[PDB]
Write the structure tokens for this entry.
Amino acid sequence: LEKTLEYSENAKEFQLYGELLTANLYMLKKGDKQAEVINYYDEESPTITIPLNPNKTPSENAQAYFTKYQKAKNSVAVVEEQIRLAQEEIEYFDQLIQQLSSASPRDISEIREELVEGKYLRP
Amino acid sequence: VVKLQIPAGKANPAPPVGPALGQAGVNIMGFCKEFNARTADQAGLIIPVEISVYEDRSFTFITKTPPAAVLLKKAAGIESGSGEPNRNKVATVKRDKVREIAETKMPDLNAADVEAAMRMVEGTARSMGIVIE
Amino acid sequence: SRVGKKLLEIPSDVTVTLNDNNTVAVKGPKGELTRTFHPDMEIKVEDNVLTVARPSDQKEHRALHGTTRSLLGNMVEGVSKGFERGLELVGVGYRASKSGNKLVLNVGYSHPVEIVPEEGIEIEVPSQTKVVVKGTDKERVGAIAANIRAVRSPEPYKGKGIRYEGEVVRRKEGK
Amino acid sequence: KVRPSVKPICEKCKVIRRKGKVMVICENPKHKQKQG
Amino acid sequence: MLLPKRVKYRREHRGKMRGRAKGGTEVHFGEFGIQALEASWITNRQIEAARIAMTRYMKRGGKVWIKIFPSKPYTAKPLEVRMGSGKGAPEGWVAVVKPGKVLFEISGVSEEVAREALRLASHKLPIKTKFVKREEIG
RNA sequence: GUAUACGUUAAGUGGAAAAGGAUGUGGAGUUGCUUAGACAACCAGGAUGUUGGCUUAGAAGCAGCCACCAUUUAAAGAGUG
């Protein structure tokens, strides 16, 4: 999930490069690098890493980059939620390892009781 | 001519004023200082500015009044409106600052009388979700 | 409420005949037209204006009065002003060409396209794309424009072939 | 399309009666219908 | 899908369908309905098809009153056998519908929703149909 | 009897069937407007408060949810495509 959290910044760079391409090809197709209008342009002129600029369908490649960016920000939400759930699960499973690695007998009995209470559960 | 609502405190970078002046054929950064000079005393609000175009690449900007929506946010205090106006009455604005807001819109609005203007901004206040009281 | 009642003013200088069995010849500066009509209609001409009158309220007469008045308006419009149907040959290799009275089209076929105009109808090619046909009758210039469009119909993916003035072809997306 | 149930598909469809045959013409060429 | 769970006799005569509707002629439960113009047997499969076609397009609205019930069975002899040698086994259930009879009843929706639902029901039925509504003299 | 009077049909219906579809046509009866000028056509306005609001970068009438108002008025819907 932290790999996807780095892919978030990679797709932000992809959105920058697509917005660079979008007016483009201001510049030549290749990478459409640093295409900006000298005047009467808002030169975002963001720094970009230049893959060769696709392609047969010149707007749908930049639009595909912009879609990858939307998926990336939804990933920024959901993978952080999944990391929180995974640390909660690891804390609970480390506790279960501790409680299995010996104790009581009666304690294990009421642990079973509490688990089955937690959750309703057809009735 | 391309008209647009430019925020006063964020007119420096390549957003809104960038691509509008870029297709006109002028350097944005040489006019961002001129924007920030005349938008200093109304900073923090989004001000519509008319952008006239000339053949000799000379540009003179005619500023306008702040909108009735933004002025009602100043009079009320809340920045973002409600999800459903006239269903969640989030704020109430007294009539004296309503009269002041209507009186600020003299040189651009073609209303003959101030009573017509306060009847207009009563209607704009109803779109805000703000009780006119 | 209908086209058979409005007046049709004619410009200077034209004249119209009122020959028996409804045959109308129209003289003017840019040509001559002659058509045969139906005996059921009585036509009358006033001072510098033409009127057509219905004999009854039947549906055939209600159609024929409007058609007769409309085509008389077409005659008096074409005899003094004429009618032009402009065409554009859109493409990197498209050309209308002229060799005397013959009209040659450099459409992308393997054989050169040649079309024979009839008498009284002229075609002028001023530029790369735009071409103008000239005539005094709407029917003849419409048939000529249809015959020009018939050799290459415009295909919907890209603007190619013969095209009129403003008229949208349905854009389709290829792969 | 040739069908005995010639109907206007959209609002731009126009019902006509060329040659004694009920037809629908439209700006969209997919809505062209004839019967008989 | 509608059928009686018990009958007095499993094999009956096919009957006759002369005359108008004996009852169920006027709409008196819903606001709108279908009035029959011709007489034929209506199979419970057709009733089910018309009911689903109305109910699907009326996903929000009132309930449907089914005024007809397939109480009369029909017998179907097996295929490829000789004529006679006893009456065949009963196959299905039909409702004897006369002209003028109300078939399905709708209330609690708009006018055009009811008209389109009755048209979709009528396109499944084997009879000529018409749209009727309640009359209040009265 | 190329008979008389009044209408209807335009397909060879007459002189072979249906569900269903259809601006065919002749009639009957309501209803909005109409020479203060009617339905269409041609010349002009087709607006500023206003990019009406949450939302998505962006919903500037025309993604979505929406009380859906006020002026200059001879007229304009915070908008049908």
User: Anything to note?
Assistant: The two ends of chain A are 38 Å apart (CA to CA). The helical segments of chain A are 2-23, 58-100, 106-117. Chain A touches chain B at residues 36-45 (CB under 8 Å). The CA atoms of residues 40 and 86 of chain A lie 51 Å apart.
